[PDB]
Amino acid sequence: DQVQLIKRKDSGRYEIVPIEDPLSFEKGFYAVIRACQLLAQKNDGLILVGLAGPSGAGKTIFTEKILNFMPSIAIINMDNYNDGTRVIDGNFDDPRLTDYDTLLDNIHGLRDGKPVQVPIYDFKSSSRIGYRTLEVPSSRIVILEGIYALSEKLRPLLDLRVSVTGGVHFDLVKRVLRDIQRAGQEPEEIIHQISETVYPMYKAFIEPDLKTAQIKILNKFNPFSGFQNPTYILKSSKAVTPEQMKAALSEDFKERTEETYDIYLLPPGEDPEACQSYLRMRNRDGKYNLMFEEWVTDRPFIISPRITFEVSVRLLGGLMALGYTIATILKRKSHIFDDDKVIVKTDWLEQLNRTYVQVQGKDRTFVKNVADQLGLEGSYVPHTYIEQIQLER
Numbered sequence: 001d002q003v004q005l006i007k008r009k010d011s012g013r014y015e016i017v018p019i020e021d022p023l024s025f026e027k028g029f030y031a032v033i034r035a036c037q038l039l040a041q042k043n044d045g046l047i048l049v050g051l052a053g054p055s056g057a058g059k060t061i062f063t064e065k066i067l068n069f070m071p072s073i074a075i076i077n078m079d080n081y082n083d084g085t086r087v088i089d090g091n092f093d094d095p096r097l098t099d100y101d102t103l104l105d106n107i108h109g110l111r112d113g114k115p116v117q118v119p120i121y122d123f124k125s126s127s128r129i130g131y132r133t134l135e136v137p138s139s140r141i142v143i144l145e146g147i148y149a150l151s152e153k154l155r156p157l158l159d160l161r162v163s164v165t166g167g168v169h170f171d172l173v174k175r176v177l178r179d180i181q182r183a184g185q186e187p188e189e190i191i192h193q194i195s196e197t198v199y200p201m202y203k204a205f206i207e208p209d210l211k212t213a214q215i216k217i218l219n220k221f222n223p224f225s226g227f228q229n230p231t232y233i234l235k236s237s238k239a240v241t242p243e244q245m246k247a248a249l250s251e252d253f254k255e256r257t258e259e260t261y262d263i264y265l266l267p268p269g270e271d272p273e274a275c276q277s278y279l280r281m282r283n284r285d286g287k288y289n290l291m292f293e294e295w296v297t298d299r300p301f302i303i304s305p306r307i308t309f310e311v312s313v314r315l316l317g318g319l320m321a322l323g324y325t326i327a328t329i330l331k332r333k334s335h336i337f338d339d340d341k342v343i344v345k346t347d348w349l350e351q352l353n354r355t356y357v358q359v360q361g362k363d364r365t366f367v368k369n370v371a372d373q374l375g376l377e378g379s380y381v382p383h384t385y386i387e388q389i390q391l392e393r
């Protein structure tokens with residue numbers, strides 16, 4: 001865990017000695033920070049670090065913890081370099097999406113001290129909407145975060161190669177194992193076959209790059225962290241119009257609309273319309289998200305950690321190949337007001353032909369009072385949408 005430097009023979013710049021042992025999330029967080037402090041005291045110019053890993057392993061929450069610890073660093077999200085015209089698919093996992101010409105040019109400019117125009121990618125329209133000016137930050141630390149941040153085209157220009165594995169990406173594999181395990185099967189052999197089925201590109205394209213990491217962070221998933229800081233939801237059948245929300249709520253609430261499509265998946269086996277733990281595939285603005293449906297009902301609230309990570313549609317085919325079945329499809333159209341801390345929205349679901357109001361957030365007192373501000377008392381429905389269609393048979 002001791003970070004030490006060694007002069008890389010190809011240049012005069014020093015480099016971190018590879019830590020062969022995988023590291024904890026909290027310990028890897030401190031190993032990365034101290035490695036940057038040492039690399040910035042022994043090498044001049046830009047300190048570029050590649051942060052690679054699968055979707056869901058925790059590299060996003062890793063970055064936003066480094067940013068809150070050090071606001072003087074800049075984070076570059078590698079998916080902003082995507083070019084939808086390169087592939088005919090919409091799979092974000094596809095390594096053929098990144099425009100390496102713009103990427104490599106951006107890092108050569110930042111190495112020469114120049115500010116560069118880094119692209120901004122809108123997944124809803126699947127196009128590059130514009131650019132943002134990124135100067136070399138004060139810390140001179142730039143984090144390139146992406147699934148292929150340790151690709152062969154980027155390793156010569158990286159000063160530190162960090163990989164993040166595990167998280168909810170691996171927890172889904174253990175969850176599927178809990179659902180489909182048969183007696184006599186060696187668990188490590190089934191785990192391997194689950195990963196090949198549900199993540200058909202991890203072993204081939206993603207993992208080989210992660211082995212070349214100098215700090216290998218293994219993020220062990222915590223099932224109890226979600227319910228420590230969960231999402232509190234109040235659902236109402238009242239007809240609070242979006243015009244009434246705009247006026248009642250503060251001007252800090254930003255207004256937006258969206259259409260989502262939820263696919264509810266049941267595990268294989270005979271759940272007699274009960275003991276049913278759903279997996280939810282959500283489609284929203286060009287992204288597919290897998291969600292775990294772990295719910296507690298404290299009237300009038302409904303509470304859930306809302307554990308979710310981005311997945312390819314291929315994951316749906318893999319789950320169904322492993323016995324998971326589609327219970328129902330829920331198509332909705334939503335009108336959202338977002339305080340960035342509290343969300344007040346109205347959802348219209350086609351299958352119910354009804355309109356519901358939803359106040360959600362991580363601060364339970366903030367959710368209750370905002371719902372009281374809209375006069376929602378006496379109209380609460382403490383049930384999930386999938387539970388409402390079940391009740392209205």
Ligand SMILES: Nc1ncnc2c1ncn2[C@@H]1O[C@H](COP(=O)(O)OP(=O)(O)CP(=O)(O)O)[C@@H](O)[C@H]1O
Pocket residue numbers: 054055056057058059060061062166167168219220221222223225226306307308309310
């Ligand atoms: N050790 C852990 N304990 C609890 N939750 C964890 C976890 N590691 C990862 N997660 C969960 O993983 C989810 C998504 O991971 P995160 O966004 O942090 O990294 P990521 O970039 O790989 C996913 P995405 O690509 O969709 O952004 C979050 O809901 C987070 O709570």
Ligand SMILES: [Mg+2]
Pocket residue numbers: 384385386387
């Ligand atoms: Mg539901």
Ligand code: NA
Pocket residue numbers: 181182183184
């Ligand atoms: Na069995």
